[PDB]
């Protein structure tokens, strides 16, 4: 659950 992972 990484909010800074690739969101695109």
């Amino acid at each position: 659950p990484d909010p800074n992972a690739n969101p695109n």
Partner: antibody
Framework: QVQLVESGGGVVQPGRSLRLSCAAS????????MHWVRQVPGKGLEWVAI????????YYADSVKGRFSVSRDNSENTLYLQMSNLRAEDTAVYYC??????????????????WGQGTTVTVSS | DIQMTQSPSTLSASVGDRVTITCRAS??????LAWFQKKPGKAPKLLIY???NLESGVPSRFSGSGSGTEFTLTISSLQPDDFATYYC????????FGQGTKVEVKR
């Protein structure tokens, strides 16, 4: 040009609700994660929320958790921020901000690139 | 929560000066540090990403360096477009900003 145009700002009474929107153009909106960031008068810049490109994952700042909800309508190139139980401390310029777009997927962590010019929300009686 | 601390809060300089601004993270953020330029009444503009990589519109008099907790933005020869407030931002764990460094005109 990558363009982000916020709307919906205005005066809201404490405890009430307000929805902001952000119209995107100049890029494929449905492929980008999106953020809201605010600046309260006299305070620094403060991240508010992120939403994944497809609207699956959503995360929020502790200061708005349980009160704000982020959503998007990719078919209309629009980002939303639903604010509820508003208080004086939520008075701020609210910015729509695109998550950093990297077509090569080079890096392990993601920030932000393009900012809109903001819309102002004033919470007051 | 990672705290970002910039130094100095205000810097006075002249056109042609070499300018250095520092940013410190409260814990290690590797190279996940960005620098933004902001002018009064205008939206921030991304200048440097991944600590040291210039965005393509940015003139090469700007450079960034650092990894871990200590980062610097350098302008090798200040130009009139560069008078502004500069913010650092970590994007290792959520997103937090320094308080800003205002680069003002010396007279």
């Amino acid at each position: 040009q990558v363009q982000l145009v916020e709307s919906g700002g205005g005066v809201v009474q404490p405890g009430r609700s307000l929805r902001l929107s952000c119209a995107a153009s100049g890029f494929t909106f449905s492929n980008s994660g999106m953020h809201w960031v605010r600046q309260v008068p006299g305070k620094g810049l403060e991240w508010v929320a992120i939403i994944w490109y497809d609207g699956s994952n959503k995360y929020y700042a502790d200061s708005v958790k349980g009160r704000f909800s982020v959503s998007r309508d990719n078919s209309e190139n629009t980002l939303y921020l639903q604010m509820s139980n508003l208080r004086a401390e939520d008075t701020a310029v609210y910015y729509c901000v695109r998550a950093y777009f990297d077509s090569e997927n080079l890096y392990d962590k993601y920030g932000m690139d393009v900012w809109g010019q903001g819309t102002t929300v004033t919470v007051s009686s | 929560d990672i705290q970002m601390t910039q130094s100095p809060s205000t810097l006075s300089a002249s056109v042609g000066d070499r300018v250095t601004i520092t940013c410190r993270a409260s814990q290690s953020i590797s190279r996940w540090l960005a620098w933004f330029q902001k002018k009064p009444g205008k939206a921030p503009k991304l200048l440097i990403y991944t600590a040291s990589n210039l965005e393509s519109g940015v003139p090469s008099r700007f450079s960034g360096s650092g990894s871990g907790t200590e980062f610097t933005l350098t302008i090798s020869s200040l130009q009139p477009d560069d008078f502004a407030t500069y913010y650092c931002q970590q994007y290792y764990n959520y997103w937090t900003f320094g308080q800003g460094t205002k680069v003002e005109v010396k007279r």
